[PDB]
Design a protein around this nucleic acid. Sequence first.
RNA 1: CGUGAGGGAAAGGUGAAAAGAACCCCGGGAGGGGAGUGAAAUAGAGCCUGAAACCGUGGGCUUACAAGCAGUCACGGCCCC
RNA 2: GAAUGCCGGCAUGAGUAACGAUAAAGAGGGUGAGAAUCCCUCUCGCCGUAAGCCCAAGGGUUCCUACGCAAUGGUCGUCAG
RNA 3: CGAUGUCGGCUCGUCGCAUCCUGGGGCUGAAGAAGGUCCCAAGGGUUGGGCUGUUCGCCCAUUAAAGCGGCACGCGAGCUGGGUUCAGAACGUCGUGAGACAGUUCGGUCUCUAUCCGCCACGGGCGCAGGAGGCUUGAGGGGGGCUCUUCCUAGUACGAGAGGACCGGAAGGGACGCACCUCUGGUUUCCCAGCUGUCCCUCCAGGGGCAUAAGCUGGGUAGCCAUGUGCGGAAGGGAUAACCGCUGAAAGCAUCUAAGCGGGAAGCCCGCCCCAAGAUGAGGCCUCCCACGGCAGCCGGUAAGGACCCGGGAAGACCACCCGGUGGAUGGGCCGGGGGUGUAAGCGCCGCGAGGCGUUGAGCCGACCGGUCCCAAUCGUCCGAGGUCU
Lengths: 16, 204, 122, 118, 59, 131
Amino acid sequence: RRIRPRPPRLPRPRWR
Amino acid sequence: MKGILGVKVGMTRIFRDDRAVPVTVILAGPCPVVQRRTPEKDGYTAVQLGFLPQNPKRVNRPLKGHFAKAGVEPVRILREIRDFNPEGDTVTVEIFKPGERVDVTGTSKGRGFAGVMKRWNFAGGPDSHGAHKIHRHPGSIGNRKTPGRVYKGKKMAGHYGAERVTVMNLEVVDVIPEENLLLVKGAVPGPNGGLVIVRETKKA
Amino acid sequence: MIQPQTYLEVADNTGARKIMCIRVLKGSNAKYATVGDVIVASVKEAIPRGAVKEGDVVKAVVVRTKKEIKRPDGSAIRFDDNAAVIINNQLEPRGTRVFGPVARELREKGFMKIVSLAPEVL
Amino acid sequence: MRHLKSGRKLNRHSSHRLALYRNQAKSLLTHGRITTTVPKAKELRGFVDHLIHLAKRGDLHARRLVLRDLQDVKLVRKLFDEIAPRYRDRQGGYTRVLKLAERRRGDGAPLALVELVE
Amino acid sequence: AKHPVPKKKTSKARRDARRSHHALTPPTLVPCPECKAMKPPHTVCPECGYYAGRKVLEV
Amino acid sequence: MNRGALIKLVESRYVRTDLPEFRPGDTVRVSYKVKEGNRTRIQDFEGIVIRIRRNGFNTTFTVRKVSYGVGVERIFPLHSPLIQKIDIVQRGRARRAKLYFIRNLSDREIRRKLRADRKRIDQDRAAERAA
RNA sequence: CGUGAGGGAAAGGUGAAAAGAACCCCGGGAGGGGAGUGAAAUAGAGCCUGAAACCGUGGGCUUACAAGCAGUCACGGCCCC
RNA sequence: GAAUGCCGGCAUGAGUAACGAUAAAGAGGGUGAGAAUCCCUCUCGCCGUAAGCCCAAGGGUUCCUACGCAAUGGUCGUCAG
RNA sequence: CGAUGUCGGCUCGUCGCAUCCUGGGGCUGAAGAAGGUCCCAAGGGUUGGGCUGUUCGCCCAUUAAAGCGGCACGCGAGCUGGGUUCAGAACGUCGUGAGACAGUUCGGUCUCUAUCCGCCACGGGCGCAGGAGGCUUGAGGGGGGCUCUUCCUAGUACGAGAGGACCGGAAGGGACGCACCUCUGGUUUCCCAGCUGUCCCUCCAGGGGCAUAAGCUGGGUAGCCAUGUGCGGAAGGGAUAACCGCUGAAAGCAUCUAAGCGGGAAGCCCGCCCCAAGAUGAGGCCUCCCACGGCAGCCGGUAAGGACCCGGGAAGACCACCCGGUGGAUGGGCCGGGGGUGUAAGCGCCGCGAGGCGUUGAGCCGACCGGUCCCAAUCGUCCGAGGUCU
Ligand SMILES: [Mg+2]
Ligand SMILES: [Mg+2]
Ligand SMILES: [Mg+2]
Ligand SMILES: [Mg+2]
Ligand SMILES: [Mg+2]
Ligand SMILES: [Mg+2]
Ligand SMILES: [Mg+2]
Ligand SMILES: [Mg+2]
Ligand SMILES: [Mg+2]
Ligand SMILES: [Mg+2]
Ligand SMILES: [Mg+2]
Ligand SMILES: [Mg+2]
Ligand SMILES: [Mg+2]
Ligand SMILES: [Mg+2]
Ligand SMILES: [Mg+2]
Ligand SMILES: [Mg+2]
Ligand SMILES: [Mg+2]
Ligand SMILES: [Mg+2]
Ligand SMILES: [Mg+2]
Ligand SMILES: [Mg+2]
Ligand SMILES: [Mg+2]
Ligand SMILES: [Mg+2]
Ligand SMILES: [Mg+2]
Ligand SMILES: [Mg+2]
Ligand SMILES: [Mg+2]
Ligand SMILES: [Mg+2]
Ligand SMILES: [Mg+2]
Ligand SMILES: [Mg+2]
Ligand SMILES: [Mg+2]
Ligand SMILES: [Mg+2]
Ligand SMILES: [Mg+2]
Ligand SMILES: [Mg+2]
Ligand SMILES: [Mg+2]
Ligand SMILES: [Mg+2]
Ligand SMILES: [Mg+2]
Ligand SMILES: [Mg+2]
Ligand SMILES: [Mg+2]
Ligand SMILES: [Mg+2]
Ligand SMILES: [Mg+2]
Ligand SMILES: [Mg+2]
Ligand SMILES: [Mg+2]
Ligand SMILES: [Mg+2]
Ligand SMILES: [Mg+2]
Ligand SMILES: [Mg+2]
Ligand SMILES: [Mg+2]
Ligand SMILES: [Mg+2]
Ligand SMILES: [Mg+2]
Ligand SMILES: [Mg+2]
Ligand SMILES: [Mg+2]
Ligand SMILES: [Mg+2]
Ligand SMILES: [Mg+2]
Ligand SMILES: [Mg+2]
Ligand SMILES: [Mg+2]
Ligand SMILES: [Mg+2]
Ligand SMILES: [Mg+2]
Ligand SMILES: [Mg+2]
Ligand SMILES: [Mg+2]
Ligand SMILES: [Mg+2]
Ligand SMILES: [Mg+2]
Ligand SMILES: [Mg+2]
Ligand SMILES: [Mg+2]
Ligand SMILES: [Mg+2]
Ligand SMILES: [Mg+2]
Ligand SMILES: [Mg+2]
Ligand SMILES: [Mg+2]
Ligand SMILES: [Mg+2]
Ligand SMILES: [Mg+2]
Ligand SMILES: [Mg+2]
Ligand SMILES: [Mg+2]
Ligand SMILES: [Mg+2]
Ligand SMILES: [Mg+2]
Ligand SMILES: [Mg+2]
Ligand SMILES: [Mg+2]
Ligand SMILES: [Mg+2]
Ligand SMILES: [Mg+2]
Ligand SMILES: [Mg+2]
Ligand SMILES: [Mg+2]
Ligand SMILES: [Mg+2]
Ligand SMILES: [Mg+2]
Ligand SMILES: [Mg+2]
Ligand SMILES: [Mg+2]
Ligand SMILES: [Mg+2]
Ligand SMILES: [Mg+2]
Ligand SMILES: [Mg+2]
Ligand SMILES: [Mg+2]
Ligand SMILES: [Mg+2]
Ligand SMILES: [Mg+2]
Ligand SMILES: [Mg+2]
Ligand SMILES: [Mg+2]
Ligand SMILES: [Mg+2]
Ligand SMILES: [Mg+2]
Ligand SMILES: [Mg+2]
Ligand SMILES: [Mg+2]
Ligand SMILES: [Mg+2]
Ligand SMILES: [Mg+2]
Ligand SMILES: [Mg+2]
Ligand SMILES: [Mg+2]
Ligand SMILES: [Mg+2]
Ligand SMILES: [Mg+2]
Ligand SMILES: [Mg+2]
Ligand SMILES: [Mg+2]
Ligand SMILES: [Mg+2]
Ligand SMILES: [Mg+2]
Ligand SMILES: [Mg+2]
Ligand SMILES: [Mg+2]
Ligand SMILES: [Mg+2]
Ligand SMILES: [Mg+2]
Ligand SMILES: [Mg+2]
Ligand SMILES: [Mg+2]
Ligand SMILES: [Mg+2]
Ligand SMILES: [Mg+2]
Ligand SMILES: [Mg+2]
Ligand SMILES: [Mg+2]
Ligand SMILES: [Mg+2]
Ligand SMILES: [Mg+2]
Ligand SMILES: [Mg+2]
Ligand SMILES: [Mg+2]
Ligand SMILES: [Mg+2]
Ligand SMILES: [Mg+2]
Ligand SMILES: [Mg+2]
Ligand SMILES: [Mg+2]
Ligand SMILES: [Mg+2]
Ligand SMILES: [Mg+2]
Ligand SMILES: [Mg+2]
Ligand SMILES: [Mg+2]
Ligand SMILES: [Mg+2]
Ligand SMILES: [Mg+2]
Ligand SMILES: [Mg+2]
Ligand SMILES: [Mg+2]
Ligand SMILES: [Mg+2]
Ligand SMILES: [Mg+2]
Ligand SMILES: [Mg+2]
Ligand SMILES: [Mg+2]
Ligand SMILES: [Mg+2]
Ligand SMILES: [Mg+2]
Ligand SMILES: [Mg+2]
Ligand SMILES: [Mg+2]
Ligand SMILES: [Mg+2]
Ligand SMILES: [Mg+2]
Ligand SMILES: [Mg+2]
Ligand SMILES: [Mg+2]
Ligand SMILES: [Mg+2]
Ligand SMILES: [Mg+2]
Ligand SMILES: [Mg+2]
Ligand SMILES: [Mg+2]
Ligand SMILES: [Mg+2]
Ligand SMILES: [Mg+2]
Ligand SMILES: [Mg+2]
Ligand SMILES: [Mg+2]
Ligand SMILES: [Mg+2]
Ligand SMILES: [Mg+2]
Ligand SMILES: [Mg+2]
Ligand SMILES: [Mg+2]
Ligand SMILES: [Mg+2]
Ligand SMILES: [Mg+2]
Ligand SMILES: [Mg+2]
Ligand SMILES: [Mg+2]
Ligand SMILES: [Mg+2]
Ligand SMILES: [Mg+2]
Ligand SMILES: [Mg+2]
Ligand SMILES: [Mg+2]
Ligand SMILES: [Mg+2]
Ligand SMILES: [Mg+2]
Ligand SMILES: [Mg+2]
Ligand SMILES: [Mg+2]
Ligand SMILES: [Mg+2]
Ligand SMILES: [Mg+2]
Ligand SMILES: [Mg+2]
Ligand SMILES: [Mg+2]
Ligand SMILES: [Mg+2]
Ligand SMILES: [Mg+2]
Ligand SMILES: [Mg+2]
Ligand SMILES: [Mg+2]
Ligand SMILES: [Mg+2]
Ligand SMILES: [Mg+2]
Ligand SMILES: [Mg+2]
Ligand SMILES: [Mg+2]
Ligand SMILES: [Mg+2]
Ligand SMILES: [Mg+2]
Ligand SMILES: [Mg+2]
Ligand SMILES: [Mg+2]
Ligand SMILES: [Mg+2]
Ligand SMILES: [Mg+2]
Ligand SMILES: [Mg+2]
Ligand SMILES: [Mg+2]
Ligand SMILES: [Mg+2]
Ligand SMILES: [Mg+2]
Ligand SMILES: [Mg+2]
Ligand SMILES: [Mg+2]
Ligand SMILES: [Mg+2]
Ligand SMILES: [Mg+2]
Ligand SMILES: [Mg+2]
Ligand SMILES: [Mg+2]
Ligand SMILES: [Mg+2]
Ligand SMILES: [Mg+2]
Ligand SMILES: [Mg+2]
Ligand SMILES: [Mg+2]
Ligand SMILES: [Mg+2]
Ligand SMILES: [Mg+2]
Ligand SMILES: [Mg+2]
Ligand SMILES: [Mg+2]
Ligand SMILES: [Mg+2]
Ligand SMILES: [Mg+2]
Ligand SMILES: [Zn+2]
């Protein structure tokens, strides 16, 4: 359990 | 360790002391002994029983020769009972009286290719709230890079039923020796008309 | 088959009218309470100035269920509703009467005060 | 599974499968010999023997009952007046499904004949 | 899914090995007791119309 | 080997003939043996048969009563050794074989949909006239 | 191909000479097998030469207790010269 | 010998997904080298503010008939835009 | 960085043990009951709800208990998509401004097809020195492993009282597992009935299609089912853990140990259930054929058997398995029984009529239990040992 929220590294795969 | 081969015939409830007892009826007797396993000959101890007489046409030479070493008429099924050496050369329902407890062994009803819900009681997925084509699906089957594989014996969909099942410690409700019947309280594996094995229980 | 969230009719003069099951007192993780089982419930509707009021947390015993209860003789008996009688921590009724039949199973479970108070024990 | 279930589905729904039997009953009772795929043929025996049997009986009830399927007053007449009497002494088994040796070219379906017995 | 896709081209060995079960079994045929021509058993002989002793169809 | 026969045999020792005939709709009274504590009595249960599901020896019938403002349905095995006697108390003419539909009906509504089976009543009074 | 301005391919070779295969056979046709032409017909038109991947038939050696970047070093066995 | 190189050819996945509305088919008789698929009959089902009919745009011989079936038709084809 | 998809949930788990409970313990400031503390122990178990996207947490009602953790903060080629990274919009705030903020708020495209490994199942091949049909031993492996309450002992030991046992003995539960369909309760696509609109057959009557892939409604067999029923955890034999001892020196005493021996856990090993000789280490037993013709080899004809093809089956995706193939009850029909529906049509009678009464528990009637050669498993074909060497 990690207390500091972990930012995402990828944007949601967006339709080209 | 007494034992007998018989076919399961169907279920009912008799009445006994103002209580209805679910029973299944087993045509047990009679079972001629056709070979005996002894420690000299075979290392262990067991009796080869036969069951249901058979049209001598349908029995090849080698099988028919087996019966002749014992003077038994051609029979349909041959089965051993381990650590059983009866006094006579015919096992019948008489070796069981009411009150006794038995183990009954039979080939279960085959459910064929069974999904993970019917076979392993999994819960599947939601039926709304977004669930997408996984309604009867198992879910995850592993972890990630470690171990990076699926455990042996991982419960999955596949064939389910038509396997051996022994249901144990069933009360012997009645015995009808004139009819070679054998009442048994409760459920017994296999369909009606399926060959079961009735043995003395191993409980307390 | 009473499980939490199930509404029940109260068959006594304790004030209550409907109670809502929130726990079946049958060990760790029992699924449903049949006739004779004890439940903690919430008083959802009740007449004014009763021995119990709206919003209490009472215990009760399930006297009759809408699911049929079976019996070792081979018979079975279902009722038209699921009902209960408010009790105390000593299993005794908290009213002075009960209304409508109660299942005979209460006696075998030891609720003789309720069973005697009934109009019919089926 | 399928345990102890009776009745081919024949990849048709309820109505369609009934028609397929009826329109094959009319055709079998019209010419007394039709060629079909072996599956439909085996299912045709029992659908038609009932109709023949009911004709053998002969009452007004049996004719109106057979009329629910065959729907053709002239064809029902052929059944009662010409077909059924041929079998007054026969105890069921009024039809026969024998298999053919060549298949359909288009889809390889194995075929058989169904004919009213003598 | 996420479009599974083969990782390596299958070898001339692995595809031929797969096809070890793909050979055909020659049709099972018996002689016709009337006209002696090889025909499938339990079918009306398509060369003489006979089956079970008598003639059944015009060939 | 006939297996339905063998099952028919096992049940024979328990079969009853002494009970009267009665169809769905017939109002009826089942004198039933009950075990209340340390004694046994004959509790009666009287009501309308709303269902009869046959399975040879394993046939059962359901009877519906109204006890102190509360519907009560009760299922009996037709060959229960705890059935002392059954008394036909009224003959009703139903149109269906299972009468669950009378659950959601007032008393007046039921009296309309279930009238006295005059043909089975007159046959009843004509029987019992034995000499 | 693009509404349009505009974009913009691929595609050469029988033989010295058509002497381009009459006629026969199987085939519905396509295709073949004979006959025939030619120095040559795996030059026969899907035509000089005709590589490689790729597919297939026959043959030799080998392989169903085996752990692999597939080879390399040794030795033994079988087949051939 | 490599440029997610360029052109072309041929592999793999593989006899695998698919074969394009779940309105629905069945038999008999023709045709023919060959027919589930073409023609004829009868039975059955589907649309019927259309899935019928008439006009306009657009398309440009697709119309009619006769003779054909290599390719086009998601199968077949004796049929066909 | 020519991509290692990111929180939480769902699902499916598995492992560790710094052990929440159950088991075994020593100390206790342990009377008893109940606690504290530490030691052994990972077999199994560890509830349902309110709140918030929440993990976490608080709370409700329980409980034997409501453990903490690893597995890419396990798990998106498994699902979700509420939180969080896009583009819209607004609030507070910062900025002259375009705009910006671990400050809020509403909204916002998650990809049909598995090649290889792995996993669940199921076959084909060859092998297991002669060819075959049966029946088997079990090396090895998996499954399972939970727990509560009341009562008797006994209101006894213990305690001023309140309270309240050890041990031994009976009964009844919860959740979970395997099988089952007699009973309870489902489904039951055409098994029966009722009903509306419309088109039709054939006008009346009687019927058919369609209204869903059952038009609709009331019912419903077998089968498959659970909410239903039976059964399981154990008993027990053994080796131990912490801990307690016996006898006992080194060390005249003492010490559970240095020689030796007891006792001692839900844990380990056997035991129970299931798989299993590809266990190549390919086992054992019963039974069957056997010196075949021609140049450890080859080509053929056979034997015991087997396969093919067919009728099928609570077996089943195909394959496999099991049953039967006329000297036969395998399926289809037919008869009987069951069971469902609940009193057909036709006629008679009563009523102006919708209707009602009677014939009548009739008519119809899937699958269940049987019988019956009426129809279909015709006729046949192909494989198949002659047995290496010390
Ligand atoms: Mg977290
Ligand atoms: Mg892109
Ligand atoms: Mg068996
Ligand atoms: Mg399940
Ligand atoms: Mg299961
Ligand atoms: Mg289960
Ligand atoms: Mg859930
Ligand atoms: Mg669900
Ligand atoms: Mg979605
Ligand atoms: Mg979607
Ligand atoms: Mg999906
Ligand atoms: Mg969905
Ligand atoms: Mg992944
Ligand atoms: Mg690894
Ligand atoms: Mg199996
Ligand atoms: Mg017991
Ligand atoms: Mg049965
Ligand atoms: Mg059998
Ligand atoms: Mg009341
Ligand atoms: Mg009373
Ligand atoms: Mg299924
Ligand atoms: Mg099956
Ligand atoms: Mg299904
Ligand atoms: Mg059948
Ligand atoms: Mg049908
Ligand atoms: Mg289909
Ligand atoms: Mg179809
Ligand atoms: Mg299809
Ligand atoms: Mg329809
Ligand atoms: Mg029938
Ligand atoms: Mg007539
Ligand atoms: Mg009919
Ligand atoms: Mg064939
Ligand atoms: Mg064709
Ligand atoms: Mg995807
Ligand atoms: Mg998708
Ligand atoms: Mg997939
Ligand atoms: Mg590949
Ligand atoms: Mg390759
Ligand atoms: Mg190759
Ligand atoms: Mg290749
Ligand atoms: Mg491959
Ligand atoms: Mg039966
Ligand atoms: Mg009433
Ligand atoms: Mg009326
Ligand atoms: Mg263009
Ligand atoms: Mg242009
Ligand atoms: Mg351009
Ligand atoms: Mg060129
Ligand atoms: Mg020719
Ligand atoms: Mg010619
Ligand atoms: Mg032509
Ligand atoms: Mg030519
Ligand atoms: Mg030529
Ligand atoms: Mg020349
Ligand atoms: Mg040439
Ligand atoms: Mg050359
Ligand atoms: Mg050249
Ligand atoms: Mg040149
Ligand atoms: Mg060339
Ligand atoms: Mg070769
Ligand atoms: Mg080669
Ligand atoms: Mg080898
Ligand atoms: Mg080895
Ligand atoms: Mg190797
Ligand atoms: Mg290594
Ligand atoms: Mg290497
Ligand atoms: Mg060397
Ligand atoms: Mg060499
Ligand atoms: Mg280079
Ligand atoms: Mg590329
Ligand atoms: Mg480049
Ligand atoms: Mg080129
Ligand atoms: Mg290219
Ligand atoms: Mg190419
Ligand atoms: Mg390719
Ligand atoms: Mg290919
Ligand atoms: Mg395939
Ligand atoms: Mg594939
Ligand atoms: Mg497509
Ligand atoms: Mg496909
Ligand atoms: Mg199409
Ligand atoms: Mg549509
Ligand atoms: Mg389509
Ligand atoms: Mg649709
Ligand atoms: Mg429509
Ligand atoms: Mg046609
Ligand atoms: Mg003709
Ligand atoms: Mg065609
Ligand atoms: Mg054709
Ligand atoms: Mg047609
Ligand atoms: Mg045609
Ligand atoms: Mg078509
Ligand atoms: Mg017709
Ligand atoms: Mg209209
Ligand atoms: Mg048009
Ligand atoms: Mg124009
Ligand atoms: Mg155009
Ligand atoms: Mg035209
Ligand atoms: Mg063409
Ligand atoms: Mg063509
Ligand atoms: Mg042309
Ligand atoms: Mg074509
Ligand atoms: Mg197309
Ligand atoms: Mg033509
Ligand atoms: Mg990166
Ligand atoms: Mg970059
Ligand atoms: Mg890359
Ligand atoms: Mg990438
Ligand atoms: Mg990637
Ligand atoms: Mg939550
Ligand atoms: Mg403890
Ligand atoms: Mg303890
Ligand atoms: Mg302690
Ligand atoms: Mg204490
Ligand atoms: Mg104290
Ligand atoms: Mg520890
Ligand atoms: Mg543990
Ligand atoms: Mg709320
Ligand atoms: Mg928030
Ligand atoms: Mg929080
Ligand atoms: Mg507690
Ligand atoms: Mg405790
Ligand atoms: Mg909780
Ligand atoms: Mg965990
Ligand atoms: Mg994670
Ligand atoms: Mg996703
Ligand atoms: Mg996620
Ligand atoms: Mg992935
Ligand atoms: Mg959304
Ligand atoms: Mg969002
Ligand atoms: Mg939001
Ligand atoms: Mg400034
Ligand atoms: Mg400002
Ligand atoms: Mg400023
Ligand atoms: Mg923002
Ligand atoms: Mg943030
Ligand atoms: Mg930010
Ligand atoms: Mg916000
Ligand atoms: Mg919206
Ligand atoms: Mg694969
Ligand atoms: Mg790999
Ligand atoms: Mg694999
Ligand atoms: Mg194998
Ligand atoms: Mg050996
Ligand atoms: Mg051998
Ligand atoms: Mg064998
Ligand atoms: Mg064994
Ligand atoms: Mg073992
Ligand atoms: Mg192994
Ligand atoms: Mg083990
Ligand atoms: Mg355990
Ligand atoms: Mg006491
Ligand atoms: Mg006391
Ligand atoms: Mg005790
Ligand atoms: Mg477990
Ligand atoms: Mg049943
Ligand atoms: Mg059932
Ligand atoms: Mg049932
Ligand atoms: Mg039922
Ligand atoms: Mg029907
Ligand atoms: Mg007309
Ligand atoms: Mg009419
Ligand atoms: Mg109608
Ligand atoms: Mg119509
Ligand atoms: Mg219509
Ligand atoms: Mg329709
Ligand atoms: Mg609708
Ligand atoms: Mg209808
Ligand atoms: Mg229904
Ligand atoms: Mg059923
Ligand atoms: Mg049923
Ligand atoms: Mg249950
Ligand atoms: Mg000492
Ligand atoms: Mg020692
Ligand atoms: Mg001691
Ligand atoms: Mg010990
Ligand atoms: Mg235990
Ligand atoms: Mg075994
Ligand atoms: Mg072996
Ligand atoms: Mg074995
Ligand atoms: Mg080994
Ligand atoms: Mg070896
Ligand atoms: Mg062996
Ligand atoms: Mg051995
Ligand atoms: Mg089975
Ligand atoms: Mg099969
Ligand atoms: Mg089969
Ligand atoms: Mg076999
Ligand atoms: Mg056989
Ligand atoms: Mg045979
Ligand atoms: Mg034969
Ligand atoms: Mg038969
Ligand atoms: Mg039969
Ligand atoms: Mg009946
Ligand atoms: Mg009537
Ligand atoms: Mg009538
Ligand atoms: Mg009438
Ligand atoms: Mg009149
Ligand atoms: Mg009836
Ligand atoms: Mg019947
Ligand atoms: Mg006979
Ligand atoms: Mg022959
Ligand atoms: Zn012939």
